[PDB]
Design a protein around this nucleic acid. Structure first.
Ligand SMILES: [Mg+2]
Lengths: 545, 95, 94, 110, 120, 109
DNA sequence: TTTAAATATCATAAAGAGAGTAAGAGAAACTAATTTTTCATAACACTCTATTTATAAAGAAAAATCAGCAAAAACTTGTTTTTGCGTGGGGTGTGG
DNA sequence: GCAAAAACAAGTTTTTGCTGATTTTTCTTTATAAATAGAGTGTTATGAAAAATTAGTTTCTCTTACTCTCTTTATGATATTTAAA
């Protein structure tokens, strides 16, 4: 059996895979492995260096994105067999029946992509480190080896192993498709050696799988998975996988021999070897009266306990509606009288065509760079934008300044725009980024009960206990938050929320109407168009009352 | 009279430096001379002149209006000796 | 310090402006001052001082290396009067 | 030059400022070519931006008539690069290039 | 009037904007050729794109005159040539097609698949 | 009888396809136009002979108008032959005499 | 008894318009960033003078910066050129 | 299926050392110029705040390029009918 999984991070696997004498020890192989001069034994530091991108040669395959190395380390090519072989190798059957069997890695699909607007090239070799494991995750006997194939392959130029989501012509696509074929490729060699060793072989079921009585007893993981689940099976396997626990090899042998007390055969080698969505519309022409009525209806909905969401398009219109909503809630008493003030950071979107353009950088805004060493963002405030050197001057919380050329900015930098906002009893807030100290994430709808000009009472969703946040008057310590009473059309999806929306005479477009219905079960739409003339736009899937 | 604002505008027009850049640069240009005179160095601006520093002994000064003698305290002063080139451009600089 | 050292200090403090641009700014400021003096005009910078031209009437003269007397033409000469802040900062006595 | 050079001008629409005595030139060109005023201005701006990247100039001084120019993505990037390279605001750079193209090439049918 | 050609053009159907002064002339040429109106327009345009890859424009001859729209459905090669000319000239696809059709009507009033050109 | 058909042997079918497709005209309209052209040019049409009849005959349809139908009716007095002859034989003669024919002013090319 | 026609009648396929969509025109309004005006307000100027301290005069050397240039180093522009998702999958259920 | 990060060639701007050019610094004795305390009076540079204003973006009404769909003759084949040898 070969189970194939994607390695996630170099730092994880480098320590994980490097960490009864074991099986035999660690190893490595590959037709391209010997080119770098590394064979057999492989050190921990070099293994993690190869996983992150540091080749034994001078090449470097690191790919920095979002402040982190997004390069995929490689693919884990595992090799495993039923409990029969592990029970054999427990006698201590020489182990090599599996090690040489895997040492089928003697790679036909190995290829790299080399453009010239158009192509793959048959490199045909790679560097694969093989780590030998003795038991399963239940510590029950299961001899298997993880052959970690790093995403590093040598046309005389190094490149990552081929991948292509469209076309599926690359190495990884073929390996994933040929999973069962490669499993059956491995399947044969153990029996081929056993034909000289004379032990029993027999097909057991699906896909020609072949596999001594205690074999059923040593399959606790398979039995538990079947009990829990009755392929995407994978969820149960991930959920029920306990972490590795240390066991003394002779104590483990004692436990195995005691638990297998009754059903068995040894005395097998003694003889066998002798081998030789509704909607409703209201019409109000003027913005002031329409917003006042909409906000009053929203406040009435909030008072009775009905879940409601405000909805307008456009930033300025959103601000106006938010002001009206807050005023009407204050009249209704849902929002508390003693308002306070605080600062917050709202994200500014950037991309490749824009982050090298000076026009969107302004003094008074915040820049954060993810420090890979401190594992936190260093916060700066832009003090100067200079055209003569195309350079921003950034000031830290300590007050020192540094000059950075715009051509040297990249995805590691995040640009935020400071803002100010009032807060009172019952205010609704949206988290816009990785808020420190909380598992809350972007878009989450926090609620605040009370404030004391120095700290806030906030209800984290699902925490069921009052968490507290600081009040800050500086960009360097402001929270990545926003007010969440009025949202953007189609921003959030809800199957039951009522959307108290307002639409102008020109926002009736298809996308706005589709997102509006998507935002909730029902919409109490307020329209700028005349009564029953706004209903002309209802020639769509959403229905009237 | 010539003004820091006038020199700032002149730098803006002839070099393109931003208004903040020109203002800060002229203010720093004056402040650096003030600091270099504060710490006792001589400033030799070739083509314009020298800012020598002179140490003065006490003198028997007086109040000219009342005639009462009031001693001049010993002090250190800045003296500007124009160079040869600047004087040539100024010899006929009639207002 | 000389002019080059002054330019170096200004460039070091003003990191964003290139050194060549700072040198050009210093030379242009000096030329502006020299031209304003040549135009018979007064320079006044609060906290630094004032530049002005004073008339010298035609007078007698002598060549001290030989002693021969030579009368000269009347001409203007530059003069400098330090400001309050510069006087306080440059002096080291009470 | 840098009358309003520090401002942000990433938008796709330019409220072109024209002297009242070249608005007549633009209207005449529009009538002769059939193009809308914005079309004529934008296409002449593209032509000038491609032909002359360096546009050193001495810098009107009368009443001004404002017109709406709706650039496309390619013209907007070139114009922003040019305004950053010259220090002028987007309106002034666009007006200078449009006026130069109008005076030098009176028809521009290509 | 004539707008900027911002939108990308890849569809095969085009609404030919012909001045009412020249719609009748195209109908006359069509009954001269024995070909259908729309097919006459297509067969004119596909060869006009061949004869004059570079095409100087007329100076808004009709302008304020009324216009009528004719349904056109082009083939792949004609569509490709038209889009190439549209990108090389900066007008919209409708205006480029209309102007080239008018030019081919004026120059060759009895065009016959590039082998015979004109009689009137 | 507005509908009448043309006896076209196998050999002339390829020539008709070539001439009509290069002309950019449909088969029916091309047939009617060619028939009217041959009727126009030779009002004194005489026996030409049915030489091609040594091949399998195929029919191409057409729909006449009043003018051409009456012209064929009157031309059938000139021959005493069948109406399929009156329609087809002159069409074959025109197809072998004037391919590449836009109008009367443009000659055989 | 065929057969050479005579005249319908469905099948559908280049045509040919009506409607919907979404984006361009053009004059208009809003918004905040840059520019010019207004306005304190303290620094500057001038006078009163008895007397102590500097510095032009010139002119030919020592010498002390400098600037223009030639060469390299940082740097931006435009264009290729490599990568990564995410996958599929037999069991013995592994690979944070 | 496409960005986005990385390599690479191409100028382009900014910095850096060299060496003659160019400007500075020295010395001789003698006259005026300048240096200056306090105080009063009137000017004037100059930074803060405010008002103007203008670049930039968003709005409102209309129009029409571009596409989809509904209708229509047009081309054509299948089909029934018919007069003569
Ligand atoms: Mg393992």
């Amino acid at each position: 059996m070969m189970s194939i999984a994607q390695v996630r991070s170099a730092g994880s696997a480098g320590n994980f895979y490097t960490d009864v004498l074991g099986s035999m020890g660690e190893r490595w192989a590959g037709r391209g492995a010997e080119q770098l001069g590394l064979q057999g034994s492989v050190d921990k530091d070099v293994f993690t260096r190869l996983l992150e991108g540091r080749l034994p040669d001078g090449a470097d395959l690191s790919r920095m994105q979002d402040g982190s190395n997004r390069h995929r380390p490689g693919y884990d090519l595992t090799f495993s067999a039923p409990k029969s072989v592990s029970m054999m190798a427990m006698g201590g059957d020489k182990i090599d029946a599996h090690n040489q069997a895997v040492d089928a890695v003697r790679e036909a699909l190995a290829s790299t992509r080399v453009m010239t607007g158009q192509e793959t090239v048959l490199t045909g070799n790679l560097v694969m480190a093989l780590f030998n494991h003795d038991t399963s995750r239940d510590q029950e006997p299961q001899l298997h080896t993880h052959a970690v194939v790093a995403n590093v392959t040598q046309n005389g130029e190094w490149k990552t192993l081929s991948s292509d989501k469209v076309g599926k012509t690359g190495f990884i696509e073929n390996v994933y498709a040929n999973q069962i074929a490669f499993g059956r490729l491995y399947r044969e060699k153990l029996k081929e050696q056993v034909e000289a060793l004379g032990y029993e072989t027999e097909v057991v079921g699906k896909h020609g799988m072949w596999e001594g009585v205690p074999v059923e007893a040593f399959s606790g993981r398979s039995q538990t998975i079947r009990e829990a689940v009755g392929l995407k099976r994978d969820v149960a396997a991930l959920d029920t996988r306990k972490s590795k626990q240390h066991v003394d090899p002779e104590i483990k042998m004692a436990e195995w021999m005691q638990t297998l007390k009754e059903t068995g055969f040894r005395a097998y080698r003694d003889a066998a070897d002798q081998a030789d969505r509704p909607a409703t519309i209201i019409s109000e022409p003027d913005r002031n009266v329409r917003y006042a009525r909409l906000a009053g209806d929203f406040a009435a909905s909030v008072k009775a306990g009905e879940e409601s969401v405000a909805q307008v398009s456009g930033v300025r219109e959103q601000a106006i509606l938010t002001q009206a909503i807050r005023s009407e809630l204050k009249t209704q008493g849902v929002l508390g009288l003693p308002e306070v003030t605080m600062t917050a950071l709202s994200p500014v979107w950037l991309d490749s065509r824009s982050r090298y353009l000076r026009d969107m950088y302004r003094p008074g805004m915040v820049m954060e760079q993810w420090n890979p060493e401190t594992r936190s963002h260093d916060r700066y405030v832009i003090d100067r934008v200079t055209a003569q050197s195309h350079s921003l001057t950034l000031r830290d919380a300590q007050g020192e300044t540094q000059v950075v050329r715009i051509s040297s900015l990249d995805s590691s930098w995040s640009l935020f725009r400071p803002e100010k906002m009032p807060v009172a009893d019952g205010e609704r807030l949206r988290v816009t980024g990785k808020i420190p100290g909380l598992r809350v994430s972007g878009g989450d709808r926090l609620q605040v009960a009370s404030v004391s000009e120095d700290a806030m009472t906030v209800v984290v969703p699902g925490r069921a206990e009052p968490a507290t946040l600081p009040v800050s008057d500086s960009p360097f310590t402001a929270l990545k938050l926003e007010n969440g009473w009025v949202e953007t059309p189609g921003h959030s999806v809800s199957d039951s929320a009522t959307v108290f929306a307002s639409v102008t005479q020109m926002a009736m477009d298809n996308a706005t109407l589709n997102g509006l219905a998507r935002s909730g079960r029902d919409v109490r739409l307020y329209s700028s168009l005349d009564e029953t003339r706004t209903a002309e736009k209802l020639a769509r899937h959403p229905s009237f009352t | 009279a010539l003004t820091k604002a006038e020199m700032s505008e002149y730098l803006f027009d002839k070099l393109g430096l931003s208004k903040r850049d020109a203002k800060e640069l002229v203010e720093l240009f004056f402040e650096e001379i003030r600091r270099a005179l504060e710490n006792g160095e001589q400033v030799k601006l070739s083509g314009f002149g020298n800012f020598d520093l002179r140490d003065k002994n006490q003198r028997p000064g007086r109040n000219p209006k009342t005639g009462e003698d009031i001693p001049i305290t010993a002090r250190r002063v800045v003296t500007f000796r124009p160079g040869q080139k600047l004087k040539s451009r100024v010899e006929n600089a009639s207002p | 310090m000389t002019k080059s050292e002054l330019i170096e200090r200004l460039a070091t403090q003003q990191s964003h402006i290139p050194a060549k641009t700072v040198e050009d700014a210093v030379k242009e400021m000096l030329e502006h001052m020299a031209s304003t003096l040549a135009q018979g005009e007064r320079i006044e910078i609060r906290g630094f001082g004032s530049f002005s031209l004073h008339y010298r009437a035609p007078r007698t003269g002598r060549n001290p290396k030989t002693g021969d007397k030579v009368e000269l033409e009347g001409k203007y000469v530059p003069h400098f009067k330090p400001g309050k802040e510069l006087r306080d900062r440059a002096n080291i006595y009470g | 030059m840098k009358r309003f050079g520090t401002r942000s001008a990433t938008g796709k629409m330019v409220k072109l400022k024209l002297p009242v005595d070249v608005e007549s030139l633009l209207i005449e060109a529009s009538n002769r070519s059939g193009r809308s005023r914005s079309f004529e201005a934008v296409i002449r701006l593209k032509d000038h931006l491609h032909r002359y990247p360096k546009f050193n100039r001495a810098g009107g001084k009368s009443l001004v008539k404002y017109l709406t120019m709706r650039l496309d993505d390619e013209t907007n990037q070139l114009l922003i690069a040019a305004k950053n390279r010259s220090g002028w605001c987007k309106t002034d750079e666009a007006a200078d290039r449009v006026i130069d193209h109008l005076i030098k090439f009176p028809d521009f049918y290509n």
